């Protein structure tokens, strides 16, 4: 599913990501834009052989099981395909675990390079939240 910007903002808010671990909702919408263009089906292979899945490009080296990343953890205890659903619950629940691990949203390289330090509130401007 390719979410609309406000559509994804409302879904994230309803799932309690807004202000989670101190990250206002625009941070999550900005990260999702650059990680996946709001497309739940996005997948990308990493150089180490792991793959990133879903709206927040959650990786199989640590967080989900895709059956092909040797030496892996599955810290969210889910198949990586659950992160590609039109229902973003699994992506949100797993993102909450990732952002609570010590490095905050710096775990998402695209958030650090393209959202951190920018006016991230602009990502939810005009949305009826
Ligand atoms: Cl915001
Ligand atoms: Cl933090």
Swiss-Prot record:
<feature type="disulfide bond">
    <location>
        <begin position="76"/>
        <end position="94"/>
    </location>
</feature>
<feature type="disulfide bond">
    <location>
        <begin position="6"/>
        <end position="127"/>
    </location>
</feature>
<keyword id="KW-0964">Secreted</keyword>
<dbReference type="GO" id="GO:0005783">
    <property type="term" value="C:endoplasmic reticulum"/>
</dbReference>
<feature type="disulfide bond">
    <location>
        <begin position="30"/>
        <end position="115"/>
    </location>
</feature>
<dbReference type="InterPro" id="IPR000974">
    <property type="entry name" value="Glyco_hydro_22_lys"/>
</dbReference>
<dbReference type="GO" id="GO:0031640">
    <property type="term" value="P:killing of cells of another organism"/>
</dbReference>
<dbReference type="GO" id="GO:0016231">
    <property type="term" value="F:beta-N-acetylglucosaminidase activity"/>
</dbReference>
<dbReference type="GO" id="GO:0005615">
    <property type="term" value="C:extracellular space"/>
</dbReference>
<dbReference type="GO" id="GO:0016998">
    <property type="term" value="P:cell wall macromolecule catabolic process"/>
</dbReference>
<comment type="similarity">
    <text>Belongs to the glycosyl hydrolase 22 family.</text>
</comment>
<dbReference type="GO" id="GO:0042802">
    <property type="term" value="F:identical protein binding"/>
</dbReference>
<dbReference type="GO" id="GO:0042742">
    <property type="term" value="P:defense response to bacterium"/>
</dbReference>
<dbReference type="GO" id="GO:0050830">
    <property type="term" value="P:defense response to Gram-positive bacterium"/>
</dbReference>
<dbReference type="GO" id="GO:0050829">
    <property type="term" value="P:defense response to Gram-negative bacterium"/>
</dbReference>
<feature type="active site">
    <location>
        <position position="35"/>
    </location>
</feature>
<dbReference type="InterPro" id="IPR001916">
    <property type="entry name" value="Glyco_hydro_22"/>
</dbReference>
<keyword id="KW-0378">Hydrolase</keyword>
<keyword id="KW-0732">Signal</keyword>
<dbReference type="GO" id="GO:0003796">
    <property type="term" value="F:lysozyme activity"/>
</dbReference>
<feature type="disulfide bond">
    <location>
        <begin position="64"/>
        <end position="80"/>
    </location>
</feature>
<keyword id="KW-1015">Disulfide bond</keyword>
<keyword id="KW-0020">Allergen</keyword>
<dbReference type="InterPro" id="IPR023346">
    <property type="entry name" value="Lysozyme-like_dom_sf"/>
</dbReference>
<feature type="binding site">
    <location>
        <position position="101"/>
    </location>
    <ligand>
        <name>substrate</name>
    </ligand>
</feature>
<dbReference type="GO" id="GO:0005737">
    <property type="term" value="C:cytoplasm"/>
</dbReference>
<comment type="subunit">
    <text>Monomer.</text>
</comment>
<keyword id="KW-0326">Glycosidase</keyword>
<dbReference type="InterPro" id="IPR019799">
    <property type="entry name" value="Glyco_hydro_22_CS"/>
</dbReference>
<keyword id="KW-0929">Antimicrobial</keyword>
<comment type="function">
    <text>Lysozymes have primarily a bacteriolytic function; those in tissues and body fluids are associated with the monocyte-macrophage system and enhance the activity of immunoagents. Has bacteriolytic activity against M.luteus.</text>
</comment>
<feature type="domain" description="C-type lysozyme">
    <location>
        <begin position="1"/>
        <end position="129"/>
    </location>
</feature>
<dbReference type="Pfam" id="PF00062">
    <property type="entry name" value="Lys"/>
</dbReference>
<keyword id="KW-0081">Bacteriolytic enzyme</keyword>
<feature type="active site">
    <location>
        <position position="52"/>
    </location>
</feature>
<protein>
    <recommendedName>
        <fullName>Lysozyme C</fullName>
        <ecNumber>3.2.1.17</ecNumber>
    </recommendedName>
</protein>
